[PDB]
Ligand binder design. Structure first.
Ligand SMILES: Nc1ncnc2c1ncn2[C@@H]1O[C@H](COP(=O)(O)OP(=O)(O)O)[C@@H](O)[C@H]1O
Ligand SMILES: Nc1ncnc2c1ncn2[C@@H]1O[C@H](COP(=O)(O)OP(=O)(O)O)[C@@H](O)[C@H]1O
Ligand SMILES: Nc1ncnc2c1ncn2[C@@H]1O[C@H](COP(=O)(O)OP(=O)(O)O)[C@@H](O)[C@H]1O
Ligand SMILES: Nc1ncnc2c1ncn2[C@@H]1O[C@H](COP(=O)(O)OP(=O)(O)O)[C@@H](O)[C@H]1O
Ligand SMILES: Nc1ncnc2c1ncn2[C@@H]1O[C@H](COP(=O)(O)OP(=O)(O)O)[C@@H](O)[C@H]1O
Ligand SMILES: [Mg+2]
Ligand SMILES: [Mg+2]
Ligand SMILES: [Mg+2]
Ligand SMILES: [Mg+2]
Ligand SMILES: [Mg+2]
Lengths: 285, 285, 285, 285, 285
C-alpha cells in the first residue's frame, strides 16, 4: 500500500515516504558506552550506530551492508503503525543484475528491529528497482522533458550518465569519480604538513572555515569530470540536467561554463529520489 | 495469409502489415546494463538493441545482418497471435540475384525470438522480392501512370532509377549516392574545428538547430545527384517521381528546378513500401 | 639544426630525436608527496607528473594541454647541451587549421623547465606540422609506394584514412573510433558485476591475465572499424598499410581477413613518426 | 663510512647497523628513583628513560621528540669506537617535506650523551630519508619485483600504500589507521566494566592470556583496513606485499582472504628497514 | 518533587540541591576519640568520618563505597523536613552499564542516618544518571552550543571526552589520567629526599607555599594530557570547553596554547553539575 523510496548513496542516505528526509551514511558496529543519545538499530542481535564512525566506501553497493541504514530510514520515514509497504530502491545505472541478489533477500521478508529501543516490525509487499539519474528525469520540469537531454548525476563516488531522446533513452553509463576523490585530493596535501584529517571530517572543515579551498581546485575537478564525459557525450549538445549534491557544491562554478544550454536541477539532493518516487505512483497507483 | 512489407533501408526501417510504422536502422550488439527501457531482440542466443548504436553501412544489404531488424519489425507490425505470413521485401534494383541467397535462408523457416522478453514465434509461408523504386510506381496516382515517367528514389546511400513506359519498364539502374555522403561532407568541416560529430548524430543537430546548414549546400547536393542521372536519363523528359526521405529533405529546393514536368511523391517515406504492398494484394489476393 | 618529431597521441607519446623512445600520455597536476621517484616537469610554476594519473581524452588535441608532455619528450630525446632544434609535429589529417593556433604559441619561443629538478632551457628555430598516417607513407617500403595504397592508422581514439595514388593523395578523412572505445566496452561489462576498472588500468589487466577477452570481441571491433571505411574506401582495392598500436594489438586477427592485398606495417608504433621524420630530412636537410 | 637505519615507528623502534635489533617506543621524562636497572639517555641535561612510561602518539613524527630514541638506538647498534656514520631514516610516504626540518637539525651535528652513564659522542656525515613501505620493496624477493605489486605497510597508526609498476611507482598514499585504533576499541569495552587498561599495557594482556579477543574482532579490523584501500587500490589486482607488525599479528586471518595473488612479507618487522638498508648500500657504496 | 545532583568525584564531592556546595572526598572508618567536632554519618551501625583520612582511589566508582558521602551530601544540601527527592547522579561516560547495579540498590529505598547525631530519614522517588562532561554542555553558554564543540573534563583521575555536533554527540571516550598522577609524580621526587608526603596532603603544601612547583611541570602535564587526545580529537578543530578543577588549576597555562578556538569553562568545578542539573529541570519539570 504505502510507498517508500531510499537512495542509500555512499556518504548520504535520502529517504522519502510518508515523511521525507536525509542523513549521513556513516555506519559503525563499534562498541559504544552512552547508547542513549545516538541513533542506532539492532538487527538479529548485531547493533549499529548511524551518523558516525566509518563510511562504507565499498563499491557495488548491492552488498555493502545495506542493512541497518535501510531499516533505520524505513522507520524514520513511515510510522510505527505501518506494517506493509512497497520499496523502490535506486541502484547505479550499471549494476542492474545485482537486483537479482537484492530481491531474493528482501521480497516477502519481515524485518524486526529496535530503532533506539522501541522494538517494531515491518514487511514489504514487493520490491522495485530503478537506475540512478534516470529516476530524476521524472522529477524534471516539463519544459526540459520534450527535448533531447542528458541526465548527469555527480555522486560522491559515481558519475551517472543517462542520455534521453524524446521520452526514450539512448546512452547509459557510469564513471568511477565523485566528491570523494576531491576530498582525498585535499587531504593528500593537508595531512602532509602536520594534520590527521580523513575523507569523513574534511567537508565539515570546509563548511566551518578551516580549510582554505582555492577557487581553482573546484575548476580542476570540473575539468576532470568533464574530461570523463567527452567519449560518451558532447555536453554542448544534449541539454544537461546536473543532479546530486556535488552539483549544489559546484553550482556557482558550473554556471560559468561555455555550454550553450544546461541547468542545475533544483533540490538535486532529492531529485533522483523524487523522480523515482513519481515513477512509483505510476506503477502501483 | 497475412502480408507484411519491410524496407530495411540503411538508416531507417519502414514496415507495413496489420499495423504500419517505421524506426531507425541503428543496431548494436554491445553489452547493455539497463536492458528494460530499450527495444531489443534476442535470436538464437545473441542479443541486439535497436534504435541506437552503430548504423550498418555495409552495401549489398542482402547480408548486412538483416536479422534483428526484420524480426523486430514483424513483431511490431503484426500481433502475437499471428503465426504464418507472406513477406514482401524490397531490394535495390541491381542486387536481384542476391534474392537467391535470401530465400534459401528464410523460406519455410520458423523464427523464435524475445522482443523485449515476451518470447514468441513466427513462420513465413512464402517470400517475395521487389526492386526498390519500381514498387512505388504502384502507389503512384493514376494521372501519372499513363505517361512515360521516371521513378527516382533518393536513398540514404543509393539512388534508384527506374524508367517506365506506358505500364512497362525501359531503363533500370543504381548509383552509389545519397544523404549519407551529405552527412559525411558536413562532418568533414564540423569535426575539423573542435568537434566529434559523426554520420549518426548529425541529422538531429540540424533538426534541433546547432548546425547552420547554408542553403547552397543543398543546391550543391542537388547538382551532384542530377549530375549522376544525365548519362541514363534526361530529367526534362520522363516526368519524374521523386521518392525517399531525401526527397522530403530537399523538396522546397527541388520545386524550384528548371524541369518542365515533375513532382515530389506524397508520403514518399512509405511510397516504395505502399507500392510494393499494393503489388502483394495483386499476387496472393 | 637538430630535428625532433613528437606524436602526442591520446594514450601514448612517441618521440624521436637524437634518441628515440615512447611513454604513456597520462598526465596529472595532482599534488604528490614523494616527488623524487616520479617523472615530472614544472613550467612557469605549475608542476605535472607524467606516466600516471588522468588520460586527457579531449579531442582536437591542438589544445588538450600539449604542454608538459612536449617539453618532457624534448628533454628526454635530445641532451642538455642542445638549445635550438626544429620541431615536426603530427596532427590528425582533419585538424590542420589548428596549426595556426599552434605555431603562434611555439614558433620563436624559449621554454625553461625543470625535468626532475635539473633546470634547463630550450628554443625551437621553426615549427612544422604533418598529417597523421600520411607521414607513415614515407617510412613505408619502396615495393608498396609505387602502387595505389591506403594508409590506415588505427589510433586509440581516431582512425585516419589517407588514400595515395602514385605518389599523390586522393582521399583524406578521419573517424572518431579506436581502442579507447573497446576499453570502454570491456569496462561496461566488467565494472557492472562488482569491479571498479576504468579505461586506464584495463589494458594492463589484459596483459597480465585477469580479463578474459574472448577472441570474438576483437572480431566485433574489426567489423566495426571496417564498417567505418566502406563509404570512403573499398579495402579490397587500395592495398592497405595498417599503422598504429591497435594494428599490433589486432594483427593476428587482421591477417585472416578476406582482403586480396594488404599488410600490417612493421614497427607501426613509430611508423607515423619515422615517416614524418624522414620528411624532415627532406625539408631542412 | 658506517651506515645505520632507524625506523622510529610509534610503538616500536627498529634499528639496524653493525648490530640489529628493536625495542619499545615508550619514552618518559618522569623522575625515577632506581636509575641503575633501566635503559636511559641524557641529552644536554634532560634525562629520558626508554622502554617504559608514555607512548608519544603525536602524528607527524618529524617533531615528536625523535631525540632520545634515536641516540639510544645509534649507541646500541654500533659500538663506542665509531664516531662518524651515515643515517638513513624512514618517514611516512606523505610527510616528505618535513625532511627539510629534519636535516637542518641533524646534518653535520655532533651529539654527546650518556647511555646508562658511559658517556660517549657521535657524529653523522650525511643524512638520508626514504618513504615507509617503499623501502621494503628492496628487501622483497626477486620473484615479486618484476610484477606490478602493491606494498602495504600496516603500521600501529599509519597505513602506507605504495603501488609499484615494473620497477617504478604509480600511486603513493597514507591512511590514519593501525593497531592503535584496535587497542583503543578493545579498551573501550574492557575499561567500561571495572578495569583501568590503556593502549600501552593491553597487548601484553592479550599475549599472556587475560583478554579474550574473539576471532571476529580481527575480521572486523581486516574489513575496516580493506575498506580504506578500495578508493586507491583494488587488492585483487596489484599483487600485495603486507608489511609491518600488524601483518604478523593478523597473518593467519589474512591468509584466508578472497584475493587471487598476495603474500605476507617474511620478517615484516624489519622489512621496511632492511629494504631501505639495502638502498643505502646502493647509494654510498 | 525536589531535585538533587551529586558529583562524587574521586578527591572532591560537589552537591547541588536547595543549597549548593562541595567538600572533600576523603572518607575514613577509623575509630575516633573526639567525635564531636568532625563531620560524620552512621549508616546501619557503621560510622564514617568525612573530610579526613583515606581517599578511596578505587576506579569504577559505581562500587567504591558511594555510601556515606552520598547521604552526607543529601543532608547538607536539602533540609530535615524534605523526605522525597529525585536524584540525578553523574557517572563517567564509559561506565554506564554500572547504572544497572546502582538503581537496584537505590530506587525506592528509604535511608536513615545520623548526620552528626541528629537522626533523620530520606527517600528518593526515582534515580537518574548522566555521563560526566556531557552534562556540562547544558551549563555552557548559547554562543558555543551551536558550533561543533568538544567537552573535555579533566578530572582528578579520569579525562572525559564528549564531542558534540550541532546539538548531537559523535564521539565519547575516557582516559585514565588526571591530577592524581601529577601528585604522584611530585611525591615521587619529594618523598625521595627525606620526606613523607602522600597524594592527600600534597596539594595543600603547594597552596601554602612549601613545594616549589616549577612552571614546566605543568607544561609537561599539559603535553601528557594533550598527547592522550590526538587519537580521538584534533584540538585545533572542535572548539574546546575545558571543565573540572584541573582546568582551573592549569588555566593560565592552557590560555597560552597554539589552539585557534577554545576556552576554560567558568565555575568549571560545578559545571558538570549545573549542566546535568539543568537537564533535571527538563525531565521532571
Ligand atoms: N546543502 C549543501 N550545501 C553544499 N554542499 C552539499 C549540501 N548537501 C550536500 N552537499 C554535497 O554533496 C555531496 C552529497 O552527494 P550525494 O548525493 O550524497 O552522493 P550520492 O548521490 O552518490 O549518494 C556531499 O559531498 C556534500 O559535500
Ligand atoms: N519527416 C522528415 N523530415 C525531414 N527529413 C526527413 C524526414 N524523414 C526522413 N527524412 C530524411 O530522409 C532520409 C531517410 O532516407 P531513407 O528513405 O531512410 O533511405 P533509404 O530509402 O535508402 O532507406 C534521412 O536521411 C532523413 O534525414
Ligand atoms: N607492444 C604492444 N603489444 C600489444 N599492444 C600494444 C603494444 N604497444 C601498443 N599497443 C596497443 O596500441 C595502442 C596504442 O595506440 P597509439 O598508437 O598510442 O594511439 P595513437 O596513435 O592514436 O596515439 C594501445 O591501446 C595498446 O593497447
Ligand atoms: N612477534 C610478534 N608477534 C605478534 N605480534 C607482533 C609481534 N611483533 C610485533 N607485533 C605487533 O605488531 C605491531 C608493531 O607495529 P609496528 O611495525 O611497530 O608499527 P610501525 O611500523 O607503524 O612502527 C604491534 O602492535 C604488535 O602487536
Ligand atoms: N579553587 C581552586 N583553585 C585551584 N585549584 C583547584 C581549586 N579547586 C579545585 N582545584 C583543583 O582541581 C582538582 C579537583 O578536581 P575534581 O573536579 O574534584 O575531579 P573530578 O571532577 O574527577 O572529581 C583538585 O586536584 C584541585 O587541586
Ligand atoms: Mg547517488
Ligand atoms: Mg530505400
Ligand atoms: Mg596516433
Ligand atoms: Mg612503521
Ligand atoms: Mg569529575
Amino acid at each position: 500500500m504505502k510507498i517508500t523510496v531510499v537512495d542509500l548513496g555512499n556518504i548520504n542516505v535520502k529517504y522519502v515516504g510518508e515523511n521525507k528526509g536525509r542523513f549521513s551514511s556513516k555506519i559503525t558496529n563499534d562498541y559504544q558506552s552512552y547508547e542513549e543519545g545516538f541513533q542506532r538499530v539492532e538487527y538479529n542481535g548485531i547493533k549499529t550506530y548511524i551518523g558516525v564512525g566509518e563510511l562504507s566506501r565499498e563499491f557495488n553497493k548491492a552488498d555493502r551492508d545495506y542493512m541497518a541504514q535501510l531499516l533505520y530510514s524505513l522507520a524514520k520515514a513511515n510510522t510505527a503503525d505501518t506494517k506493509e509497504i512497497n520499496l523502490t530502491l535506486l541502484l547505479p545505472i550499471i549494476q542492474m543484475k545485482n537486483k537479482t541478489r537484492l530481491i531474493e533477500t528482501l521480497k516477502g521478508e519481515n524485518f524486526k528491529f529496535k530503532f533506539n529501543g522501541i522494538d517494531r516490525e515491518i514487511k514489504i509487499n514487493d520490491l522495485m528497482v530503478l537506475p540512478e539519474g534516470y529516476a530524476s528525469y521524472y522529477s524534471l520540469d516539463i519544459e526540459n522533458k520534450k527535448g533531447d537531454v542528458c541526465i548527469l548525476d555527480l555522486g560522491s563516488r559515481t558519475i551517472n550518465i543517462c542520455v534521453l531522446e524524446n521520452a526514450k533513452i539512448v546512452k547509459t553509463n557510469t564513471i568511477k569519480l565523485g566528491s570523494f576523490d576531491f576530498y582525498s585530493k585535499i587531504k593528500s596535501l593537508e595531512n602532509a604538513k602536520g594534520e590527521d584529517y580523513i575523507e569523513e571530517d574534511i567537508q565539515r572543515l570546509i563548511d566551518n572555515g578551516l580549510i582554505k579551498v582555492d577557487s581553482k581546485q573546484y575548476i580542476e575537478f570540473l575539468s576532470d569530470i568533464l574530461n570523463a564525459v567527452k567519449p560518451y557525450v558532447n555536453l554542448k549538445t544534449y541539454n544537461t540536467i546536473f543532479t546530486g549534491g556535488t552539483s549544489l557544491m559546484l553550482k556557482e562554478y558550473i554556471e560559468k561554463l561555455p555550454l550553450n544550454k544546461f541547468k542545475v536541477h533544483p533540490n538535486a539532493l532529492t531529485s533522483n529520489v523524487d523522480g523515482a518516487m513519481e515513477a512509483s505512483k505510476k506503477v502501483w497507483n
